[PDB]
Ligand binder design. Structure first.
Ligand SMILES: Nc1ncnc2c1ncn2[C@@H]1O[C@H](COP(=O)(O)OP(=O)(O)OP(=O)(O)O)[C@@H](O)[C@H]1O
Ligand SMILES: Nc1ncnc2c1ncn2[C@@H]1O[C@H](COP(=O)(O)OP(=O)(O)OP(=O)(O)O)[C@@H](O)[C@H]1O
Ligand SMILES: Nc1ncnc2c1ncn2[C@@H]1O[C@H](COP(=O)(O)OP(=O)(O)OP(=O)(O)O)[C@@H](O)[C@H]1O
Lengths: 539, 539, 539
């Protein structure tokens, strides 16, 4: 359990130094299962696009901007107001919203028969209750969520039978086709900004500095290295009598400065979109190092007095919109938005450490007694690994299991002469380097010489499992002692000659790590002569 | 400018205390324009829904959850996979995505004539360049953004003439009607979670704890006190062999605990939506104090082995989705999501302080010389406000304007006997309380007695402008001296008898504050006898 | 073992509804150990003072202020520079810094003797090596950290014996007494601001807005509800040719506004500390609702031209310092800073939920087989609890343990007439309410009527363990079957007459929760007649 405070204090007062040294034994090492690097840290991991969104919220807030949420869904005529006649072309880029009608369907008599053939007992009453539920669904008074519930309730059947009725008796529901409206999703924040400002200016003291960082949707040819069907705009508007394009320049500098950028460039936007005053629509470029090229991070301009007029705004307004995903690409060094935004549809490679922590000890003794017995036994072997043969090393110990004592005589030996007790590889340690697994000896005596610079490099740069051959071997041995005791076996022999695989030293690897090791076509080279012979007797 | 370090140090070393007291004069008070409360703080203001989103990101991250972004747009068949046959009803709630076709239109000859009648010179070459631009637009190779540019480029005309051509020659663009697809917007995070997990499970080590806080869209009957067409889901999934509904209970407790909630309640969801294992769909309620009632903050459950199977997932998965806007309503005490999310479409009331800072001094002298002259003059009047009449107070001072000196004799007097120099109201101070503006005297001597408890309360609880009648009056007087000097006027009289309005003491109020003061039907009661007579001579 | 995707898809495709209902069995319930509320959420918990510090950094950053770190340690003469002669009094509140000298000690034969008697073999060489280590320590070239190491290294002894030599041969090290210096810890940020500003003004463009939120130290008579020896100042300075107190007023308003405060008060500071221009030192008050009284959150003023002059600053400077702990007290509703700041030295009460999650099931079967057997058995009893006596319920089941079959006949009975199989309390459920534990029946027939409103209240407001008597009872029974099999026992009887304690239904409570249950003088009332007789035979 825990340790004796009194005994520790007394031992320490007799002689502090001995006590400090000796008292280390009161601190147990962890179960082999849970030693580093098999012990992994757990922490929450943010998404780059969303951390960039928060950092942008704060870059705007720290410039005095007031945070807003604008309408997402806007009528097409809003886009005609802002873009003018150009909207008959620009509206190609916007998603229209469409939706299913309600079905007008009735009950009886063929349907009544279907429902009866389902095993349902229907009154006239039940038939009317359901006739009403269907009416209400036609008239829009019941949600789709709720229709299985209401049917079930109507006929007094199970929920699932409600669904059964729905799909069996009324399959014409499947013939509903979505019909489009005049409503669209905003393709940039502006489509909302006008609506928000039109209502807001008259109520507020100018100048206004507003911002919103929120989703926008474009209907594009395809998705790109730098384009998605849905993106995030880090948009703002500055409203005031004296506003000009320079305000956009200053907002772009202030946003980018806070992210570390010292160099960006402005460049006229050939499009000259009509919601912007002529010759004010400006592109902002920042440098993407991994791509080598300059990338468009933002766009700004001053709204056209014509659009502003159509929204009852009589004062100039500067707009700036920065694409969150672009900035994020630069920040985190991604070269493909699709792979940055949705990394789940791509691959998750395991590092040397990841793999080193997926290498586990197979059989280990379950009982504390024998686990410690194992550790001690390991240290014993490591102490006599060089005994000159013929050798033997006995360990007799008594274990008490309630009433009965059993005495375990584990003996590990070497009959044949001119040998040593254990062999050149018993202390080999399993490393992982560059996707490879190597069981490496502490010194390269007798190692083939092409191999040595590789193993030296893995031993230097790679990640260790901190498991030696001897460790897994002995845990296997003592686990076999436990196994023996519950199996009514009094004697057995156990031997590890030349080690050829992970299995041979009682280790295994998580299948996910194997799949990669193979897939990347790398090696698991665990090998060595480890001639360990043991006999155990259980009296 | 700035002050003399040497002179200050010397004055201080002669006698520290006198020096510390006297040296206060080296610190100028601010221009009356910029004194508190006319001086307002400026800081960025977060939006409650977005601060709640960040706090939720961190509540999830602090539980070890991994942040994700899921597809927003999903095919309808995804919903059939998750919801089963019920999707023929549930899909009513989802928005379908629709979009405009490209137009197939050609050039010539009537269009060629329109273009010519526009003032454009068209070659055969220009005609072919544009015929190609229109082809490419048909074939989807030119964006809507870019079409005015390309037309303009084709015909070598101005940008705007490009647009002119577009809308005049090809108005059939306006006849494009949006045609619907099979693509929908997700109505809750699950519709994305399945897609994400289906691809992600095989690549990753279980258990997984994922989360995303992102927009969802529902097609509802109407928007409510608690329902919007677009909302934010604070969703998560826990994936593992041993996952059960209890995981949802623990996620809901852990999310709500971090926000301060000590009391929430669970309740079965009658819907029993089919993407959830039977009898696991659970509602989470938390208490909204301003509304008095319990409100639904979240929903969770365990996905159905049938849906999981249709996505190649063979291990149970718990889903929880919390509505950000609901939680926000509880947190910030709003009772109407529409008013919380989009407060720009509602009203912005001005506090007592807001109004007190929108009360400005009208005329003030522009020249430093005369501004200080004014301040001194004010203090002079405040010193002789009780001189027994007949009174007079002269102030002769010489001002130098490059070459020429002028000597200003400002005299403020009181001819008639049994009076005092100034009158009972000269030190009245303008306060704002409960939407009202009151000019209040320092003591209630002679004040009508119904009024006294009101004015006492305004003076106690209200916000002061820190402007007294005498202040605005004298700034007006000296401003008139300046005015005089540039107007070639050597003499004038200036008098303030009984004060009746803000104007009478040289103040005015920002129109936005007036509009409210009137709208709320409150008063501006600035009144008092302040009999100040002055003559000024400029020699 | 996960579930069969193919079998599921096929079952679902035969009949979706049956399959949806039936596949619930593929979602295994959690081990009783890990069911809610024993399953707790785990998340990181911020400290109120530090969370307030961060929110304050952001309130300052959002006003355009530039964040700084100022010297913490400052010479006393700095304080004389700022405070003038008043510093001969003010310096009482400041901590002086002191430190102990290096010892001058030599070796020589009396010590050499001690070291030998310690068991250490000392050469002349070792003696000289250690003589140098002691020299270098006198001359300041060895850190205290490092001295035990160096000593050991010198004598070629263990680390611990290096320490032994140190404490045994040179115990005069203990006679070192701390000598004070002229260095002090800052008692407010100002003591650093001057230093910082003195260096910074010449290098920068005015106006400057700086802020720092960092520790300050005071020597107070004692610590208060509102005073600690060390506190955090959220300080700032505004530097510019035109600053006055009004800048302090807007900074205080802007700081407090962002925290939700609409209400604060200014009040002259009687002290008129000499580092502030006369009559500018201002106190800021905010309302602490729980304390009922107004509390001092901040102080501001304009530095004295004398102090600024002694630092070569020729331009006015407004300083404001808000005490973080005060603001935190208001925000989180603490009434005692010492208890808010250092809550570990105070008490941690367990909520009802906390205690309900510390009630554990004692004995539960280890083998999956018998665990499920147990659940099945529970449901069987719950199904036959009302069988009229004489009753019996047999459950014969055969279990396979590698080679051998064993057949377990569990028989649950009631021989005596006029009774039922189980008894009125068998389905009682354990609740926690207001610090009490109650085992409560689903219905109140036969309950003494004094008790009923209490138990009704606990059942409504309290927190359930979601464990019924029958649950723990049967888990105990089957656990005993397991014990039997391992113990070579083929028959036993098992009976639960009247329930009197938690132990009687195989439950126990965590020691920490009991300590409180007792300390707070509350009850653990679980009792009921639950007459369950069972016989078990193992063939
Ligand atoms: N599909 C998209 N994905 C991500 N970000 C986008 C997308 N479309 C536009 N943006 C962002 O919005 C801003 C304005 O878009 P704009 O159309 O002006 O330039 P573009 O990159 O040529 O886009 P398009 O392909 O629509 O012409 C850009 O700075 C970019 O940051
Ligand atoms: N229109 C909406 N606006 C805001 N939040 C919503 C909206 N619809 C659903 N939510 C959130 O998603 C969760 C699940 O919605 P669910 O449909 O299960 O319940 P509901 O409130 O009855 O919605 P509905 O009206 O669609 O039936 C709720 O906790 C709520 O937080
Ligand atoms: N010991 C302290 N603990 C916590 N905060 C303090 C302490 N001393 C001062 N503060 C903070 O610093 C500001 C200035 O302190 P000041 O000494 O002017 O007032 P005070 O509360 O009377 O302090 P004291 O009584 O220690 O002189 C206060 O607003 C308070 O917020």
């Amino acid at each position: 359990m825990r340790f004796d405070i009194k005994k520790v204090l007394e031992l320490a007062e007799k002689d502090f130094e001995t006590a400090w040294r000796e008292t280390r034994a009161l601190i147990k090492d962890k179960h082999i299962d849970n030693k580093y690097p098999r012990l992994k840290p757990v922490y929450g991991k943010p998404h780059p696009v969303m951390e960039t969104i928060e950092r942008l919220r704060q870059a705007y807030l720290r410039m005095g901007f007031e945070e807003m949420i604008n309408p997402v869904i806007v009528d097409e005529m809003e886009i005609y107001k802002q873009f003018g006649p150009e909207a008959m072309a620009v509206l190609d880029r916007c998603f229209y919203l469409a939706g299913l009608p309600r079905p007008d369907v009735g009950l009886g008599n063929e349907k009544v028969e279907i429902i009866k053939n389902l095993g349902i007992d229907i009154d006239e009453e039940k038939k009317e209750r359901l006739r009403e539920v269907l009416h209400l669904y036609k008239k829009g008074a019941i949600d789709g969520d709720d229709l299985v519930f209401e049917i079930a309730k109507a006929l007094n059947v199970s929920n699932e039978m409600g669904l059964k009725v729905l799909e069996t008796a009324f399959p014409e529901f499947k013939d509903l086709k979505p019909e489009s409206t005049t409503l669209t999703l905003r393709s940039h924040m502006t489509s909302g900004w006008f609506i928000t400002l039109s209502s807001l200016i008259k109520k507020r003291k100018l100048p206004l500095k507003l911002f919103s960082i929120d989703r926008c949707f474009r209907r594009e040819q395809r998705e790109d290295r730098s384009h998605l069907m849905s993106y995030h705009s880090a948009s703002c508007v500055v409203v005031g009598e004296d506003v000009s394009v320079d305000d956009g320049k200053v907002v772009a500098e202030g946003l980018l400065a806070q992210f570390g950028f010292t160099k960006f460039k402005f460049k006229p936007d050939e499009k000259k979109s009509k919601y912007y005053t002529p010759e004010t629509q400006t592109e902002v470029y920042a440098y993407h190092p991994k791509l080598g090229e300059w990338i468009e991070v933002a766009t700004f301009g001053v709204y056209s007095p014509i659009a502003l007029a159509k929204y009852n705004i009589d004062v100039p307004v500067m707009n700036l919109g920065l694409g969150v995903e672009r900035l994020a690409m630069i920040i985190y060094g991604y070269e493909d938005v699709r792979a940055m935004v949705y990394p789940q549809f791509y691959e998750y490679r395991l590092s040397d450490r990841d793999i080193a922590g997926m290498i586990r000890v197979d059989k280990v003794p379950i009982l504390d007694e024998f686990y410690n017995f194992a550790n001690e036994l390991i240290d014993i072997c490591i102490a006599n690994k060089d005994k000159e043969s013929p050798c033997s090393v006995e360990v007799k110990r008594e274990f008490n299991f309630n009433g009965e004592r059993r005495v375990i005589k584990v003996e590990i030996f070497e009959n044949e002469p001119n040998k040593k007790l254990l062999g050149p590889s018993v202390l080999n340690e399993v490393y992982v380097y560059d996707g490879n697994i190597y069981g490496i000896p502490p010194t390269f005596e007798g190692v083939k010489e092409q191999y040595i610079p590789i193993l030296k490099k893995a031993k230097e740069e790679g990640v260790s499992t901190n498991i030696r051959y001897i460790d897994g071997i002995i845990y296997k041995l003592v686990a076999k002692i436990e196994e023996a005791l519950v199996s009514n076996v009094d004697e057995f022999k156990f031997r590890v000659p030349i080690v050829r695989s992970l299995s041979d030293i009682n280790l295994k690897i998580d299948e996910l790590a194997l799949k990669q090791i193979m897939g990347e076509n790398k090696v698991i080279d665990v090998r060595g002569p480890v001639f360990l012979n043991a006999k155990v007797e259980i009296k």
